[PDB]
Amino acid sequence: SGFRKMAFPSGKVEGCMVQVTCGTTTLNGLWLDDVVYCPRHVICTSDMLNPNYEDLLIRKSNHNFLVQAGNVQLRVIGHSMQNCVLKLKVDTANPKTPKYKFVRIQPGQTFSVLACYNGSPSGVYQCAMRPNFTIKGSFLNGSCGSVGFNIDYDCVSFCYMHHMELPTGVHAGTDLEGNFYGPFVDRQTAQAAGTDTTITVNVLAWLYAAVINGDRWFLNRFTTTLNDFNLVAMKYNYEPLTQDHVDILGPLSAQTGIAVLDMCASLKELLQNGMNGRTILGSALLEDEFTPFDVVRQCS
Amino acid sequence: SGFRKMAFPSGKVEGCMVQVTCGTTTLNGLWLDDVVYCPRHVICTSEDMLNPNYEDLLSNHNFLVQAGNVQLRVIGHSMQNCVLKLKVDTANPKTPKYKFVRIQPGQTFSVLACYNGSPSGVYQCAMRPNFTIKGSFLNGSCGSVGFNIDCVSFCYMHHMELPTGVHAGTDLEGNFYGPFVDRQTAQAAGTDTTITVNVLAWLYAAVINGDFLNRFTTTLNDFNLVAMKYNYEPLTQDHVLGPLSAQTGAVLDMCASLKELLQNGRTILGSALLEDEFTPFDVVRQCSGV
Ligand SMILES: O=c1[nH]cc(-c2cc(-c3cc(Cl)cc(OCc4cccc(F)c4)c3)c(=O)n(-c3cccnc3)c2)c(=O)[nH]1
């Protein structure tokens, strides 16, 4: 029993976090082999409104960049820009380097965040990419260059680098290839984010997790087509559910014997009725930061 | 900005996890220097687990210790309270600076759940006032540890799941938290209560995050009255936590607000019910970047 928003063991990322300085500007970098990855606005100053990143990089030498892995000063022997990520060639290969990959993730995916300051981790926590491509993280100034990731066996899938906090208090960033998620740019101009919606297929996976752990108070005797569920779920700002979603919910239907569409009916009623004083897996709201894969890993 | 339930980095602790096998019983152990700590109920058979006599049940060779794909040679075994100690040939080189502490209820900590010696994930808990923790554990997770980092301060080692889905365990000296024993029998938690000082500290984390306050200051005596009705631990003068109101300016006003929230009853920092698993030291710790 039990159900908590658990992150992966951060150990394999902790061994990669270094500190990157360029003039007056200090933030975190990720050290994999002989390359350190960090946000490119490390070269900016307060260049915030309309930075010309190529112009600013041209005026840098290798030794403009202080790389610092704990007590050691790494030596920068090369650098280039790939989209919004900076890539620094150091002369020593990180021996703590894990087996890893870079992966772009679609909204709804979950990942762990290791929030660092100065190359020092401060905490870990679990996060979902919102449909509007943002993340409701816990980030202070100094946070940039922190990373999101999944562990799969002993291979680390890196999927997020943190670049900025938006005026609303939510956070934006890039894959490790330097391409932003969502329609954002690393510059201090007005850039609004699309409306946020509940991640429907995660709420459904959560309902199954509640049933796996012994609770069925929310079910009912109704079912629904997939279209009538979407017509209702949208009015609560719920993402559409697709046939794809319904398929990956397959294995959870099997373990419970409750058919996905039947469980959509349950969700339908919960949006209509509320909790009525009750809780589900400890919460009094419907919870959308767990994917079907997370539910399968933690519950069984 | 933002507030999440955050766990300490776990790498220092991942390096100390190992598997311990006795009979068909497998579970997790804690490898520090040349000692491996785990639960004494790893010597029991299921038939033994009904009414165990540990002293009598307790040779070396019958202890398979597995660090990764390395076998630790067991050269000595002994018991301290409800914990088993296994001396091994070789000290763990990844031994961090550490120490065994014992935490009070209302204190929070991190759990690195494990299976067959392999860290599966980490999360932030609180020691419930009824001395249980609401963690997330399957069979095979016995021996996972709770801890804080400051130096790793191990405070918890997981032993059993109670019938209600909650979990009970010991400190690393083998003393149980709460009124429980390590044998399969009839045991259930005492009625539980909400950690009042932590709800206030969480209401503070929201306020300094842009989130319900109340102009109608109450007094300490008047509040506990409200609190006892609603199953809240009484608020002491120690719980008065100065550094959080001095950083956002009112203490009995926050009590005034909580006192009102309980009666009337939207959401705060994205929870619909009042959260009591953040300590005031957590709140500063998170909103400070240490
Ligand atoms: O030496 C350092 N220097 C800079 C930072 C830094 C920089 C940013 C940042 C970066 C860019 Cl490219 C643009 C930016 O405008 C955001 C904005 C503001 C107003 C309207 C708007 F549309 C967008 C901020 C930033 O967000 N953060 C930050 C703060 C809190 C939480 N996480 C990230 C930190 C740092 O840590 N170290």
Residue showing tokens 């997939």:
A226
Task: Tell whether ligand 1 has an atom less than 6 A from the beta carbon of residue A143.
Answer: yes
Helix (H) / strand (E) containing B253? helix B251-263
Question: CA dist B43 to B37, B57, B137, B204, Å?
Answer: 13, 7, 21, 47
CB proximity list for B287: less than 8 A, separation 6 or greater: A140, B3, B205, B208, B209
Residue showing tokens 């060779």:
B61
Are A94 and A82 in contact by the 8 Å Cβ rule? The answer is no
Are A178 and A82 in contact by the 8 Å Cβ rule? The answer is yes
Helix (H) / strand (E) containing B204? helix B196-207
- Decide: residue A287, CB within 10 A, 0-12 exposed, 13-18 middle, 19+ buried: buried
Residue B37 belongs to domain spanning: 11-88
CA angle A84, A87, A88 (to 5 degrees): 145
Q: CA-to-CA distance for B204 and B280, rounded, in angstroms?
A: 9
Helix (H) / strand (E) containing A229? helix A226-233
* DSSP category for residue B132: -
At A96, which amino acid appears? K
Are A182 and A132 in contact by the 8 Å Cβ rule? The answer is yes
Question: Could you give the 3-state DSSP secondary structure of residue B140?
Answer: coil
What determination technique applies here? X-ray
Contacts 24+ apart (CB under 8 A), A57-60: A57/A81, A60/A22
* DSSP category for residue B215: S
Report the CATH number at residue A79: 2.40.10.10
Nearest Cα neighbor of A80 from A183, A180, A181, A177 is A177
Q: Read off the tokens for B260.
A: 């009102």
Q: Which of residues 125-184 of A touch B (CB under 8 A)?
A: 125-127, 136-143, 165, 169-171
Nearest Cα neighbor of B286 from A225, A139, A136 is A139
In the residue annotation, B61 being an active-site residue is answered as: no
Question: CA dist A57 to A28, A40, A81, B34, B168, Å?
Answer: 18, 9, 8, 52, 56
Mutation probe of ligand 1 site: the residue of A141, A161, A163, A184 with most atoms within 8 A of C-beta: A141
Rounded to the nearest 5°, which phi and psi values hold at B55? Answer: -45, -50
Question: CA dist B267 to A253, B222, B257, B272, B275, Å?
Answer: 31, 25, 14, 5, 11
Beta-strand runs (E) in B150-256: 152-161, 167-170
Other C-beta atoms closer than 10 Å to the C-beta of A73 total 10
Q: Which atom of ligand 1 is nearest to the CA of A24?
A: 1
Other C-beta atoms closer than 10 Å to the C-beta of A232 total 16
CA angle B223, B224, B227 (to 5 degrees): 90
Report the CATH number at residue B215: 1.10.1840.10
Rounded to the nearest 5°, which phi and psi values hold at A26? Answer: -125, 135
Nearest Cα neighbor of B86 from B108, B58, B45 is B58
Nearest Cα neighbor of A286 from A228, A239, A226, A245 is A239
Rounded to the nearest 5°, which phi and psi values hold at A211? Answer: -75, -35
B15–A contact, CB cutoff 8 A: yes
Other C-beta atoms closer than 10 Å to the C-beta of A49 total 8
Q: What is the 3-state secondary structure (H, E, C) of A94-123?
A: CCCCCEEEECCCCCCCEEEEEEEECCEEEE
Residue showing tokens 């804080």:
B148
Are B239 and B258 in contact by the 8 Å Cβ rule? The answer is no
Are B113 and B159 in contact by the 8 Å Cβ rule? The answer is no
Q: Which atom of ligand 1 is nearest to the CA of A27?
A: 37
At B39, which amino acid appears? P
Q: Read off the tokens for A210.
A: 């509640």
Residues of A whose CB is below 8 A from B135: 2, 4
Nearest Cα neighbor of A203 from A108, A103, A134 is A108
Partners of residue B157 on adjacent β-strands = B145, B170
Distance in Å, alpha carbon of A225 to nearest chain B alpha carbon: 30
Question: CA dist A87 to A29, A51, A176, Å?
Answer: 9, 18, 10
Partners of residue B158 on adjacent β-strands = B169
CB proximity list for B2: less than 8 A, separation 6 or greater: A136, A137, A138, A139, A169, A170, A171, B209
